Amino acid sequence: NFKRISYAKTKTRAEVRGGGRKPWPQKGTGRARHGSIRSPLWRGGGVAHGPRGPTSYYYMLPMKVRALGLKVALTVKLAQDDLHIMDSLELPTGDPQYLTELAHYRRWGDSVLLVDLTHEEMPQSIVEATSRLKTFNLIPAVGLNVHSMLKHQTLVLTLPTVAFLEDKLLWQDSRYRPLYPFSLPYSDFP
Amino acid sequence: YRARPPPRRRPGPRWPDPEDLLTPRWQLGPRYAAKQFARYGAASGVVPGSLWPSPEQLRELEAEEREWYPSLATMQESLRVKQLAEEQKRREREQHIAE
Amino acid sequence: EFKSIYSLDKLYPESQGSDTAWRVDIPLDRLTISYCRSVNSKAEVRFHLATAEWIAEPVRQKIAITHKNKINRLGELILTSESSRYQFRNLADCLQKIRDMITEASQ
Amino acid sequence: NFEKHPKELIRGPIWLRGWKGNELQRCIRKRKMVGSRMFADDLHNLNKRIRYLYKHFNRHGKFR
Amino acid sequence: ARALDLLRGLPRVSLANLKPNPGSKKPERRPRGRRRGRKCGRGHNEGHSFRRQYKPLSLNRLQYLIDLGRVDPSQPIDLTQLVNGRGVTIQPLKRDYGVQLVEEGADTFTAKVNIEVQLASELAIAAIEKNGGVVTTAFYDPRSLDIVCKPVPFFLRGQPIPKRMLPPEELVPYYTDAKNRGYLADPAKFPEARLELARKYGYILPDITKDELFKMLCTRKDPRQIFFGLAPGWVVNMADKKILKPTDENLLKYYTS
Amino acid sequence: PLHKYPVWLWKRLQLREGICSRLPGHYLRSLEEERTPTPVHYRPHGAKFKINPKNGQRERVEDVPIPIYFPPESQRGLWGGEGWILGQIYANNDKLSKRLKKVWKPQLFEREFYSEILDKKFTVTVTMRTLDLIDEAYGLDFYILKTPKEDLCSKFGMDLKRGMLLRLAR
Amino acid sequence: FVESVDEYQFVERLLPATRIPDPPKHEHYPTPSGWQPPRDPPPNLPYFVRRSRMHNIPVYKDITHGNRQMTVIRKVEGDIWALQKDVEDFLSPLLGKTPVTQVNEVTGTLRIKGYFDQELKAWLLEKGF
């Protein structure tokens, strides 16, 4: 639900075209009088309580708790015979078929997500072979997240990047009361 | 495949185009480039003349102090006058009650 | 350093020395103090009125006469009171009760 | 490392990019953000429904 | 820990399993039906704003932070120290006053400090001085205190350093008397007050000048200088790690108020 | 959908657009600045910050610029900066009564001046306040030389100032 | 007017901190206000207690429903039912009635109806770990 903001709209008892006057003779016929030929009771008028306004549901909810849950899902992938953590995401070959055949040979899973330490320092051969990996993916440092944490069958973390995630969760561990927004400088922020 | 790398910060503090008609006044004024200096040092900023206040503004600050700050001696004299008046009023009330 | 226009170098123009920050009756060695929560409490101080060299002989006699109820079987004068229990409010109106008793025995 | 919140990562309209109030609040934000950028039909429409909702909040309902 | 292996006793925890916790949200009943709804919800203070507010600092919690290491005693105990480690927080708004010491239970409290609060008890002054503290009370004006308390942001604000204005007339006599162990009183009148308090506390006032941190204790903060170590009117160039200070004579004069 | 630039500068937008954007830069400045004049009825308050009357609180306060209700005919002469006021009022100036819409119109006088800079006599309507303004300026030519055209707040006097400036620079 | 300066040590003490560290050593135990370090090594009890981020014994009250006072230990780990039995046993002399307690096995917590707070903190302290 993080960012989706739907746009579907409607019209109200004054939005869609037409309607100011009494529509027909209110009592001469045996029919029903109304207020308009533009209220929501007739054939063409209003969708009276439909979703008005392009709505949004952003939720900057408890971020330390989000961190702990992200850790939790990482732990789930750890115990589930999925956390195959590699030393470095180098590609010994250039063919994506090499990755596919190794993955079937490793019995890793039906889907793979490998993440590295730095995007610019991600190996060119690995991404180049990965570009045709129609179901596998490669990811940078901050991208380890929840829907991602279910996304593949298994995740391949880079070792120094694994330490980076550890340090991140460690800074997530025991965060004092924030009295300033943590984007600016601090005593030991980096 | 692999997505584009995630968002980075802006390339230091950027001054805006004063010709641009779209810019809000909050980030293009006198203290705004001061905020830019406070962001990117003098390393990206301008000469630090914006840091010190203006001489006309200096006289304005002096006027603000003169209409907004007394001296401690004046306050002490006012307190002494108030205490003397309170003691005289108390003595007069006691004399009126005694009579 | 920086000195204000209204700085203490002028705001206290006479006293430029550091020692005037804190530079300087009831004896500390002779008496014994006691506080214990008994909620309720009772805080007391006792001292040997016979050994009271800090009191004049007529003053010691007046203390032994008026505070004879405060004089114990061991000849120790003790005083206990009731407000609240720690450092500054509990021990030294016990001390000051002793001092005021001495002052009243003086005259 | 706290460079930028998720509260900016959303690609969506600047009327409502992350201050999610009620319907009446939604329109109020739409006005005070972008009202001087609409064609006259949208301005009259937003004014119309804003009057409607301001009457809607405190007049007739189930809890009183 | 049987938890992880017991989880290993199932298939891979896919997206098809992330269940909301039972008791997440009560059921969203559309107000209708044969059971819930047939009619659907209808049936058939004068000067409170001018009152000052001062944050009461629990000095037992000051002892806690002393013990817990939030605020070390090796340097002065200022509002910078009082906020910097998150032991007790200030609120600049609501027309507030600032930091002031609390009044209960100084039993078992062994440390040396130099407290600088807006207000404190005479018992609190004797509490500080019992182990030999330093007690001073200036003002902290509204914009001034707000700049002081959260010093991180104004260090990167960009304006030059403001100087603290003197307290108002009502607050003036409070700081003017050394009986409060304040900042704006006679620096010799403090000694007789210390002696009278030591008599009233039954306290042996040690010669703190003989102590090792006496020079550290000798720091009594200058008025109109919120930063304990910096210069009035300065500018914290936090990027280049520099201090931008003016040199203009009239600027120095208006700065030297 | 939404229009990109804001209509709050739409007129100003046309000011940079085309043939009119080839106008003189001095004309651009003279139509660009918006310095305000001294009021006709909005007496200026003292300073920036002052003590509250019933609260005793130092608050910063400004003054409201009352809009000058300028009838068209007063542009045809050299009136002052005064005019009428189209507003409302209470019967006893008491807010607990039913107020009615009201007007405060000026009392003009048809007078004459004889400018040496114009070297001619022009007779038009003016104000006694405008008479005092000219007398404080000590001459109609010096007054035309003195006040801003934005301070002039009159078309005929602005035209007279334009003529005087053309004569002086000629 | 301007002059470059290098005396930012005064700047350094002005920098407030975020990452709260473990406390400095107060020589005697308990502390002046009575804080404590956890004892080392930890005991061989299957009930396991972690401490706070700000380093205290993890006991808390609970207030709800007007008269509802209760309490809980939050970060329990291990075979928590043993800790529940122990809490009932300590509570057994404390109020006589059997302890009205519930664990939060997924949340890894224990909660006892009623506020027996300071004595419970004492029981955890005497446990040492």
Ligand SMILES: [Mg+2]
């Ligand atoms: Mg329709």
Ligand SMILES: [Mg+2]
């Ligand atoms: Mg509760």
